[PDB]
Amino acid sequence: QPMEEEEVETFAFQAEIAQLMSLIINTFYSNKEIFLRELISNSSDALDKIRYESLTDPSKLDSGKELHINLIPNKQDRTLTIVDTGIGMTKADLINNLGTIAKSGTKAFMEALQAGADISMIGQFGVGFYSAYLVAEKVTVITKHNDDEQYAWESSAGGSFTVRTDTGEPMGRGTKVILHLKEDQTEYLEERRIKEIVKKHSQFIGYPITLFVEK
Ligand SMILES: [Mg+2]
């Protein structure tokens, strides 16, 4: 019962990343559904990583042999969670890859959108993760890499994100991306819609994907 103390670190998003996030949140786009494709691709890439590292060193699957993606809608807390057993991210990975370091493509993507590009283009510009903000007012990333502890990344945009040691449910190895869906984006909690968009845009993923439906 004694009071637990948890360390938090707050970080500023690189300037253009912040500008991109604002643009994603504040402009209307049709075709927002592609966000799911982006997150499954990231999971896919992370699963490739672990599969390859494990040929080199089999003891990298100690933290779990199965390589897969799970989708978990929750109509009670209005969240959609994408879980993989890929490589995971170290603390430095989260800080460096998800927000503090400039991406080569950001500027090109913002011009391309200002010119009328379909939001679907985001993948090609190396900034696909931020498509989460088409549908989510807040995103939490839980992650565990073999070389590090479990950490939580979180941002409601607005220019900052935080990183902290995670003291929730141990994950083993991989990444859990939790989308707190905006009020008007709850269609992404529907099993038909999720099935629909996986079939359309994510049908050549090289790992099994399971959808967990409550009831
Ligand atoms: Mg990506």
Side-chain angles (χ1 to χ4, degrees), residues 1-3 5 7-74 76-113 115-168 170-182 184-199 201-203 205-215:
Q1 66 109 49
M3 186 166 65
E5 174 175 2
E7 175 166 275
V8 176
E9 304 190 59
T10 307
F11 299 85
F13 276 117
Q14 191 276 347
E16 281 81 58
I17 297 299
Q19 285 161 15
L20 168 58
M21 294 181 67
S22 167
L23 190 68
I24 285 160
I25 289 162
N26 286 304
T27 328
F28 174 81
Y29 298 92
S30 47
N31 203 40
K32 284 170 158 113
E33 60 199 50
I34 58 88
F35 83 84
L36 187 48
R37 182 198 67 203
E38 291 311 320
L39 301 183
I40 296 169
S41 301
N42 290 343
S43 299
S44 181
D45 293 350
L47 287 156
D48 288 351
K49 272 177 228 159
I50 190 72
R51 179 172 62 103
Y52 283 102
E53 279 187 28
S54 77
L55 302 180
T56 300
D57 168 2
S59 79
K60 273 161 178 211
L61 299 165
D62 274 7
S63 49
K65 305 217 185 149
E66 262 180 272
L67 304 186
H68 57 43
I69 306 179
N70 293 329
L71 298 181
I72 311 174
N74 181 326
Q76 291 71 248
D77 70 2
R78 307 206 337 248
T79 63
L80 176 60
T81 300
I82 300 93
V83 175
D84 63 72
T85 56
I87 196 71
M89 291 174 276
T90 69
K91 180 181 169 168
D93 286 342
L94 275 179
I95 297 164
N96 283 321
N97 302 15
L98 292 171
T100 61
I101 235 77
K103 296 322 291 272
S104 280
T106 321
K107 279 216 253 286
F109 188 53
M110 296 192 301
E111 283 172 26
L113 291 179
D118 188 277
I119 193 64
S120 181
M121 289 311 303
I122 191 157
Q124 262 146 320
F125 293 82
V127 286
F129 168 90
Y130 304 99
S131 67
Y133 294 89
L134 298 160
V135 299
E137 57 193 358
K138 185 179 76 209
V139 168
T140 314
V141 187
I142 313 293
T143 200
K144 171 75 178 76
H145 180 295
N146 283 325
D147 290 347
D148 210 340
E149 284 176 289
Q150 207 163 284
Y151 280 91
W153 178 112
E154 188 155 88
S155 174
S156 286
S160 298
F161 69 89
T162 71
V163 172
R164 85 192 58 209
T165 310
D166 184 25
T167 46
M171 245 192 314
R173 190 204 57 246
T175 304
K176 162 169 60 204
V177 173
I178 305 164
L179 304 176
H180 300 87
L181 292 193
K182 289 163 186 166
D184 67 337
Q185 299 295 323
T186 64
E187 69 194 84
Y188 301 115
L189 304 167
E190 286 309 327
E191 51 267 44
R192 179 191 304 297
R193 187 76 166 108
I194 294 168
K195 285 187 278 161
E196 175 175 31
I197 70 179
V198 166
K199 199 63 175 105
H201 298 275
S202 293
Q203 65 167 345
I205 292 298
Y207 304 98
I209 316 176
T210 310
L211 174 66
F212 292 89
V213 180
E214 181 77 34
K215 278 190 97 66

